[PDB]
Curated annotation (Swiss-Prot), chain A:
Its EC number is 3.6.5.-. Its main location: nucleus. There is a cross-link at residues 64, 145 (Glycyl lysine isopeptide (Lys-Gly) (interchain with G-Cter in SUMO2)). The modification N6-acetyllysine is found at residues 30, 53, 64, 92, 127, 152. This is GTP-binding nuclear protein Ran. Expressed in a variety of tissues. Residues 61-77 are annotated as: Switch-II. The keyword Ubl conjugation applies. It comes from Homo sapiens. PANTHER family: GTP-BINDING NUCLEAR PROTEIN RAN, RAN GTPASE. GO terms for biological process: actin cytoskeleton organization; cell division; cellular response to mineralocorticoid stimulus; DNA metabolic process; GTP metabolic process; hippocampus development; mitotic cell cycle; mitotic sister chromatid segregation. It is an enzyme of class 3 (hydrolase).
Length: 209, 994, 122
């Protein structure tokens, strides 16, 4: 297993933490809780070339929660720059995040990601998104919410860091799960927890799943 | 123990800092996190900069030195001008010395690029503060220190690159207009010396890393320097020969030559034209001899992704497209430049075959520019015949589905242009691609889909007669394909492609009624195939064909007993029997499109009556039961049938608009009774079960009924032609049914769709229902404001719909706000300012627009007590609220409308268009003009809000603002200058004279 | 590690786990929910893989003691306690909810889950 430092940058509210959380746990966080400085989370993918680990430095986009700023970029081996296709300012600021990033990390693979393509009223049109071309960035339309192109940024970076263009993500092996007997001194503990859970509504009952 | 460095009452244990930093960068989990928090508090300590000197001398951890330079950066950019001159010269000399030192130790130069680069940027921040007024010798000294050492010379090229970026590329948002111009003019004055240095290094050569750093700086220079530095020196030749031959210099040289291709150049000068040709010839010759010939398989190379090949190939596409888009006419007139012109285009053909969507888009933008030119420019297309033939194949093999709207649009336009230029070549390629689907050699779902999308894209380009033979040939071949293919999966794919192509060829269908009838009857057959995608495609194709060919369904065609719309409606139960509800609604929508073509009223109304027969009978029984036994509404299945009846009405009303009235008239009274009855049950259930009831399937089903009812009424009223009937028949029962039910439900039971429906009512007929608008406000205003004024998050739909409703009421029925009691009018001002403070662009923008429109509404009233009371009560609330969101840095998306609002408010006072004094008596000499008092109020307000500003800065800023309050672009400039200056100490007040 | 297993039932689902601390459902995955019979032990497990990453969001025996219960908010979901799921490695207890495209799918799921509960009693 090899490990690579990935730095994730972009304006506040663009979906950086939401995107990482979904990759870590599968969960979709609807609330906006601004990152304070950086959160570091190990993220592992299974490839036809073995497991790859990203040490993901999810940085703060809001100036006032910025912390060490470019201090987070030191010895990064790859990067995602994030904006929100529903907010023009977030794309206008992409050149500023790229500037600060490449001044510290001169020769690293970088994906530009336009998040929230699930939202119908799109403000940053395909026609407008050209910044990546002269800067040799990979570009993907993504949605952390619909999972549109959800795996693409990491698959592309994995291909670049390992130096194999045919690297594929593969099904992580599935061990036989253990059999158990319910512990009779938690019987009364379980009917409770299960009562709260039956009477708490599932989110987003209008979606396809 | 790590928390020791935060204890500033003791001297800094450097070795402790180095452990904290190490733990942060190299550590894990709980330990990494504690280091993170500690380092952040250390860096943010306002005195931390005093420790920088110590850290840069005595730390062995370059990560610690990096963070020291971050701390120094915050001082230099924010508080620099508070320091005595001697202290500023001390820091400046310390930074220079540290840079020269690190550069003179080969070991540290090689290994510590992060810390050196960071030092160079720190130096450039000092130059932005100090240079040239307090450092006129910086450039001569840098030029001098360059000849002393290769390492220092290379690093001086990094400093000059960063200086050029900071002054030319990133100055616009980070500096005042005046300071940007000062630094630009300053770099312009000394560029001659800088260029001499860069040219010498590029001529005398040797060290690759030095040559690359110099070329990196030249790329930045090219954004702003005059052309003569490129065209009147050897440099064009060096770039286009020497530096293209070595792979270390090739990437940067190509990026330089791309920007050279964008220089501002004289257009009427033969020598410069020849020079522009020569550097292109040289560059392409170097590529053909040192990298790859014209024939090379760039698809294969890019895919193999060896070294920097992907980047180089991207950069080559950017160079060829940029140069040819500006200069290809230079290469077109001259027999001797024909080979160069076609080779450059042949390289673009090869680049266009690379499997890389973003690179493909770059080449496709060029191809669009070229084929557009060849369509209109005389005597040009014959040059490009073999290029265009290859491009036809590349576009056809890369056609994406129309769902990818920008890429499909780009590809279609290029293929349409290419089809016009040679229709026979396009036809031959498409028929032969089809033959290789039939012979199995190229067969796959992707490949038949791609080809079908391509064939569809060129509809309208051929003559009607050529199109006729082509389309018949394609439909026959695709049928052959389907029969030949085994198993429902394969047959469904080809049947969908048949449906797709037929749908894109309406001109053929309109001319061949026999064939159109067959197509529709075949789509009806397919509406009984449960195989996934077939019913959706049959329904989508039905409505698409109808949208284009509707006239042919509404007339009696030769040899038919009746208009075909009659035949569709007669068999509708059987046709739609196996469809899902959304498919049934599409079908009925399509029927509504046809019926709206019938302009005989009696016949339209009868067709509308016949189409709505099944939903109307299902409705009549469900109302002849629902009322006679109110229990039948609790049954899951009845609620689904009712919601689907309403949805069928919405679908038909969407396509028919004004023509829908008689159908709305049939159900309107019972529909509003159903709305009341369903509301009752929702209220009941929430009482019996709790707020959780709103999450249950049963209550969501009931609420769906209410929402589709509100959607039906908003759909009709938004397209209605007879507004007298809207006002006299629809509005009163609607308001009686929906307003009190909204007001008297708990927040979690209120449908935001009510606000949306009312917005459409006020929009279309607000001017005719002054009393109705008052009642809408009384019912929704205070109870909606209370839902959305505790935070920025709760009830997001209500939030958005609420400010849309207030916007339209303020536009159409401003008199409703005059009627409000004083306390309610105050809540309205509070509500507008609350909208200003949102980050949600939907709310913020309506908030600022309402504010504009309200000032306009008050201005209109002229000199009367309400307008004079309004200004006394609210003028300073609007000025100060607008300044708050302008200056707080959390509302930048609102800048333009904030500036417009502030400009309007300042201009009112500047033009003496406010009749009363704005100051309460004995607060200023009673003769005093509102202009002098506004100046005073704002000086005082900005002094308390930004106490680090001087009186001179604020007075100069306000003098500029009030002078520029009729020129939005300049006023906006002054505002942005102020936003720069509030972020630092000691900003020059003369900047506001720019 | 699925090559020694018969696929008894496949259905598209979204899976949730209950966070008792936050008192909210949190999504764990979307993708194919599979009932797999091991051809050596004739034991039937739930194995669920996420779309595009194929990472495991559910891996546990369909224990005979488990009961599918309605959720107050859905006519197309089941909640059930699991004592030992190994999706994230070390066996843990979860309160799960699994939601389907339709009521029909959820009812079919429950049918198949009882069929697998009986097969697990042998
Ligand atoms: C099989 C099929 C599936 C879907 C759809 Cl939307 C249409 C069809 N057609 C039904 C039978 N059709 C014919 C069956 C027989 C004959 C004949 O040669 O007499 C002709 C035709 N029709 C055409 O040649 C044709 C129709 C529309 C367009 Br646009 C272009 C061509 C062709 C396939
Ligand atoms: N519709 C939609 N919302 C999204 C998407 N991704 C994220 N969001 C939402 O947008 C907000 C983004 O929040 P975060 O992920 O915390 O934003 P961030 O970029 O981490 O912000 P900072 O930490 O301040 O830099 C949350 O409310 C998310 O639920 C997406 O793809 N679609
Ligand atoms: Cl992980
Ligand atoms: Cl794009
Ligand atoms: Cl690219
Ligand atoms: Cl200039
Ligand atoms: Cl031209
Ligand atoms: Cl017509
Ligand atoms: Cl119906
Ligand atoms: Cl009121
Ligand atoms: Cl408020
Ligand atoms: Cl303020
Ligand atoms: Cl400050
Ligand atoms: Mg975050």
């Amino acid at each position: 297993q090899v490990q690579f430092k990935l730095v994730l940058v972009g304006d506040g509210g663009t979906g950086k933490t939401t995107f990482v959380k979904r990759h870590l746990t599968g969960e979709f966080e609807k609330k906006y809780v601004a990152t304070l400085g950086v959160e570091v989370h190990p993220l592992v993918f299974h490839t036809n070339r073995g497991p790859i680990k990203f040490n993901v430095w999810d940085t703060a986009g809001l100036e006032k929660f910025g912390g060490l700023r470019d201090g987070y970029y030191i010895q990064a081996q790859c990067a995602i720059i994030m904006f929100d296709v529903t907010s023009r300012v977030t794309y206008k600021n992409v050149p500023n995040w790229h500037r600060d990033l490449v001044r510290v990390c001169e020769n690293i693979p970088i994906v530009l990601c336009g998040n929230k393509v699930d939202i119908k009223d799109r403000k940053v049109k395909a026609k407008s998104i050209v910044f990546h071309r002269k800067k040799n960035l990979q570009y993907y339309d993504i949605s952390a919410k619909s999972n549109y192109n959800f795996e693409k940024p990491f698959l592309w970076l994995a291909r670049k860091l390992i130096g194999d263009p045919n690297l594929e993500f593969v099904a992580m092996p599935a061990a036989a799960p253990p059999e158990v007997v319910m512990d009779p001194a938690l019987a009364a503990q379980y009917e409770h927890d299960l009562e709260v859970a039956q009477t708490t509504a599932l989110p987003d009952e209008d979606d396809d799943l | 123990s790590m928390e020791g460095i935060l204890d500033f009452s003791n001297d800094l244990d450097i070795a402790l800092l180095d452990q904290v930093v190490s733990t942060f960068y190299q550590g894990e989990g709980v330990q990494q996190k504690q280091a993170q928090e500690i380092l952040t508090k250390f860096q943010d300590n306002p005195d931390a900069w005093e420790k920088v000197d110590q850290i840069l001398q005595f730390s062995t951890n370059p990560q610690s030195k990096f963070i020291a330079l971050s701390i120094l950066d915050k001082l230099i950019t924010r508080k620099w001008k508070l320091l005595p001159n001697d202290h500023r010269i001390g820091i400046r000399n310390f930074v220079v010395g540290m840079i020269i030192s690190m550069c003179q130790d080969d070991e540290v130069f090689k290994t510590q690029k992060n810390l050196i680069n960071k030092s160079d940027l720190t130096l450039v921040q000092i130059l932005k503060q100090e240079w040239p007024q307090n450092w006129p010798e910086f450039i001569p000294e840098l030029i001098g220190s360059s000849s002393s050492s290769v390492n220092v010379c290379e690093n001086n090229m990094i400093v000059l690159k960063l200086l050029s970026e900071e002054v030319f590329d990133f100055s616009a948002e980070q500096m005042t207009q005046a300071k940007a111009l000062h630094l630009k003019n300053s770099m312009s004055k000394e560029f001659e010396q800088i260029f001499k240095l860069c040219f010498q290094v590029l001529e005398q050569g040797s060290s690759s890393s030095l040559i690359v750093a110099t070329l990196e700086s030249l790329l930045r220079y090219l954004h702003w320097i005059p052309y003569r530095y490129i065209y009147e020196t050897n440099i064009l030749e060096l770039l286009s020969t020497k530096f293209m031959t070595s792979p270390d210099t090739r990437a940067i040289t190509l990026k330089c030559l791309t920007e050279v291709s964008n220089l501002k150049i004289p257009q009427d000068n033969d020598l410069i034209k020849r020079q522009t040709v020569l550097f292109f010839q040289n560059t392409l010759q170097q590529i053909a001899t040192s990298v790859m010939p014209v024939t090379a398989d760039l698809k294969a190379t890019y895919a193999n992704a060896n070294g920097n090949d992907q980047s180089f190939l991207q950069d080559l596409a950017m160079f060829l497209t940029t140069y040819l888009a500006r200069n290809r006419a230079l290469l077109e007139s001259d027999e001797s430049l024909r080979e160069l012109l076609l080779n450059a285009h042949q390289y673009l053909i090869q680049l266009s075959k690379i499997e890389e969507r973003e690179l493909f888009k770059t080449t496709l933008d060029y191809w669009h520019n070229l084929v557009a030119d060849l369509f209109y420019e005389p005597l040009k297309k014959h040059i490009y015949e073999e290029i265009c033939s290859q491009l036809r194949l590349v576009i056809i093999e890369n056609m994406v589905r129309p769902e990818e709207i920008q890429l499909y649009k780009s590809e279609r336009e290029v293929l349409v242009y290419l089809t016009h230029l040679n229709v026979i070549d396009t036809e031959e390629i498409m028929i032969s691609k089809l033959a290789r689907q039939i012979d199995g050699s190229e067969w796959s779902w992707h490949n038949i889909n791609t080809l079908s999308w391509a064939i569809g894209s060129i509809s309208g380009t051929m003559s009607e007669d050529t199109e006729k033979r082509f389309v018949v040939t394609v439909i026959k071949d695709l049928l052959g394909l389907c029969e030949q293919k085994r198993g429902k999966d394969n047959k469904a794919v080809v049947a969908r492609d048949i449906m797709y192509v037929v749908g894109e060829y309406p001109r053929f269908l309109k001319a061949h009624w026999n064939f159109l009838r067959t197509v529709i009857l075949k789509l009806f057959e397919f509406m009984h195939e449960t195989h996934e995608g077939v019913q959706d495609m049959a329904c989508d194709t039905f409505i698409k064909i109808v949208q284009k060919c509707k006239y042919h369904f509404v007339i009696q065609q030769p040899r038919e007993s009746e208009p075909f719309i009659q035949t569709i409606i007669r068999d509708i139960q059987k046709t739609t029997a196996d469809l899902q509800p959304q498919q049934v609604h599409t079908f009925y929508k399509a029927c509504g499109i046809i019926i709206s073509e019938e302009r005989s009223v009696a016949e339209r109304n009868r067709l509308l009556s016949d189409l709505m027969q099944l939903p109307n009978m299902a409705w009549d029984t469900i109302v002849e039961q629902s009322t006679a036994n109110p229990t039948l509404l609790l049954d899951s299945e009845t609620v689904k049938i009712i919601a689907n009846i309403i949805k069928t009405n919405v679908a038909v009303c969407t396509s028919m608009g004004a023509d829908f009235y008689p159908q709305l008239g049939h159900i309107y009274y019972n529909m509003l009774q159903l709305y009341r009855a369903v509301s009752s049950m929702i209220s009941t259930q929430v009482a019996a079960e709790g707020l959780i009831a709103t999450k249950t399937p049963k209550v969501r089903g009931l609420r769906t009924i209410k929402k589709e009812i509100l959607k039906l009424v908003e759909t009709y009223i938004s397209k209605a032609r007879n507004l007298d009937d809207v006002v006299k028949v629809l509005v009163e029962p609607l308001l009686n049914a929906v307003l009190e039910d909204y007001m008297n439900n708990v927040p979690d039971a209120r449908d935001a769709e009510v606000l949306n429906c009312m917005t459409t009512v006020v929009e279309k007929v607000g001017h005719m229902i002054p009393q109705g608008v008052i009642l809408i406000l009384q019912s929704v205003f205070e109870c909606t404001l209370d839902m959305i004024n505790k935070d920025f998050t709760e009830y997001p739909e209500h939030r958005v719909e609420f400010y849309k409703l207030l916007k339209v009421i303020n536009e159409k029925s401003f008199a409703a706000f005059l009627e409000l009691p004083p306390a309610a009018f105050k809540l309205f001002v509070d509500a507008i300012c609350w909208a200003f403070k949102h980050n949600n662009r939907d709310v913020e923008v309506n908030g600022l627009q309402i504010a504009l429109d309200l000032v306009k509404n008050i201005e209109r009233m002229g000199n009367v007590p309400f307008a004079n009371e309004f200004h006394k009560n609210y003028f300073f609330i609007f000025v100060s609220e607008t300044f708050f969101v302008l200056t707080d840095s959390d509302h930048k998306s609102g800048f333009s409308k904030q500036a417009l609002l502030l400009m309007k408010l300042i201009s009112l006072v500047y033009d003496n268009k406010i009749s009363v004094p704005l100051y309460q008596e004995a607060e200023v000499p009673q003769g005093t003009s509102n202009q002098v008092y506004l100046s005073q109020y704002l000086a005082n307000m900005l002094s308390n809000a930004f106490p680090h500003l001087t009186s001179e800065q604020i007075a100069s800023f306000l003098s500029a603002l009030t002078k520029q309050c009729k020129d939005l672009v300049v006023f906006k400039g002054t505002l942005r200058d102020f936003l720069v200056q509030i972020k630092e100490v000691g900003g020059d007040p003369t900047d506001y004279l720019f | 590690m699925e090559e020694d297993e018969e696929v008894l039932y496949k259905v598209r689902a979204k899976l949730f786990r209950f966070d008792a601390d936050a008192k909210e459902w949190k999504e764990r995955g979307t993708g194919d929910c599979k009932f797999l019979k091991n051809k050596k032990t004739n034991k039937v497990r739930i194995l669920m893989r996420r779309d595009k990453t194929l990472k495991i969001c559910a891996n546990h025996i369909i224990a005979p003691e488990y009961t599918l219960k309605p959720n107050v908010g859905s006519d197309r979901s089941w909640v059930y306690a699991c004592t030992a799921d190994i999706a994230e490695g070390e066996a843990e207890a979860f309160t799960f909810a699994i939601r389907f495209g339709s009521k029909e799918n959820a009812d079919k799921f429950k049918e198949e889950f009882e069929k697998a509960q009986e097969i697990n009693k042998k």
